[PDB]
Design a protein around this ligand. Sequence first.
Ligand SMILES: [Cl-]
Ligand SMILES: [Cl-]
Lengths: 22, 22, 22, 22, 22, 22
Amino acid sequence: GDAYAQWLADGGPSSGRPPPSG
Amino acid sequence: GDAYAQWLADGGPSSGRPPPSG
Amino acid sequence: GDAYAQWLADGGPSSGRPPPSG
Amino acid sequence: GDAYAQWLADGGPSSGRPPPSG
Amino acid sequence: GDAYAQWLADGGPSSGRPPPSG
Amino acid sequence: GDAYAQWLADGGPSSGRPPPSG
Ligand SMILES: [Cl-]
Ligand SMILES: [Cl-]
């Protein structure tokens, strides 16, 4: 949940990285 | 995770659609 | 999913609450 | 742009608030 | 801004389409 | 808006870098 939240903040799919599970 | 980002971007709980799990 | 979305809306890790799993 | 980034972090359209300009 | 969040969730620069101003 | 997506990918405000216009 925390790592996902940061991925999201980084643009989600637009980050170019797969979504984290946490 | 990716589907869930798309769901958030459409309004999430306020979108009239259930959240996906990916 | 829906709980996690409300958690983000209330500022995510700047909430002091575990991320929900829903 | 920094405010928008925080808005995305808060779920974007799911956040319950309009997108900021900065 | 809301359209731009949707664009990001579709891949942003990897989405195959231009960025929204909204 | 493309450069701004890349800036988000790189961590957004956390990167200490200013947000781009594009
Ligand atoms: Cl809405
Ligand atoms: Cl700005």
